């Protein structure tokens, strides 16, 4: 009967597979890593065609029972390209929206930062880092002023949130690019397979975090190639002294 297929990050696809063993049907769901928030509806071979926001209320004999959320929030597989970040740049991720918000950073002169909405435990996925997909060659050969929000995805791809999409008034489908740097972070970047964004990275807590605590990540620039923006070099000197 029903099958659950988990990703390493804890998200899953669940439903009755078809005669070919594929996640294809009108009652398939992607379930986020809270094992509660779900996108339920039409999938073809595990690709989300029309996922409606739902809550996983219970399971019976392994079968998930959902309640659809009010409204008509629907989502589809919408992987970015080199030039298009999203078909719905202003449509937030529903899992992320209940976990983080953007506000002025507590770090001096650091602009906006990303904050926890609620108290969470260690190993909790908080936020998604989606962006356009460009090459290391393009990124490495341009000035640092353009590389504020670049995140390496793999050996071939860098994810970027370029102007003006680094303003939430123009892009808020994901918010991972809003987390500031710390050499003593409370989060890490981790691999994530998202039903809307595809293979991206996420921000995951490494320890318990309180409500309204700023989320920080080590940006992990090369210290001995330091190939890094000036503010990072300045704080690296500071960090190294406390050691």
């Amino acid at each position: 009967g029903v099958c659950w297929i988990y990703y390493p990050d804890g998200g899953s696809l669940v439903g009755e597979v078809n005669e070919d063993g594929e996640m294809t049907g009108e009652k398939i769901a992607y379930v986020y890593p809270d094992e509660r928030t779900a996108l339920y509806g039409k999938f073809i071979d595990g690709e989300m065609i029309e996922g409606k926001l739902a809550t996983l209320m219970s399971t019976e004999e392994g079968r998930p029972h959902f309640e659809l959320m009010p409204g008509n929030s629907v989502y589809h597989f919408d992987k970015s390209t080199s030039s298009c970040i999203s078909t719905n740049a202003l449509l937030p991720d529903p899992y992320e929206s209940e976990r983080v918000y953007v506000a002025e950073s507590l770090i001096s002169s650091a602009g906006e930062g990303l904050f926890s909405k609620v108290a969470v435990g260690p190993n909790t996925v908080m936020s998604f880092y989606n962006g356009v997909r460009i090459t290391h060659q393009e990124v490495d050969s341009r000035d640092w002023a353009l590389n504020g929000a670049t995140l390496s995805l793999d050996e071939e791809t860098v994810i970027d949130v370029p102007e003006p999409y680094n303003h939430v008034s123009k892009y808020c489908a994901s918010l991972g690019h809003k987390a500031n740097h710390s050499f003593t972070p409370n989060c890490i970047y981790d691999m994530f397979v998202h039903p809307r964004f595809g293979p991206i990275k996420c921000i995951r807590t490494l320890r318990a975090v309180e409500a309204d605590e700023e989320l920080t990540v080590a940006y992990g620039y090369d210290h001995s190639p330091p190939e890094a923006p000036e503010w990072y070099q300045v704080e690296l000197k500071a960090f190294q002294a406390t050691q």
Binding site: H136, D140, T150, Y189, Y219, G220, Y221, E227
Partner: peptide
């Protein structure tokens, strides 16, 4: 590399 987390 001019990107994070490489």
């Amino acid at each position: 590399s001019k990107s994070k987390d490489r």
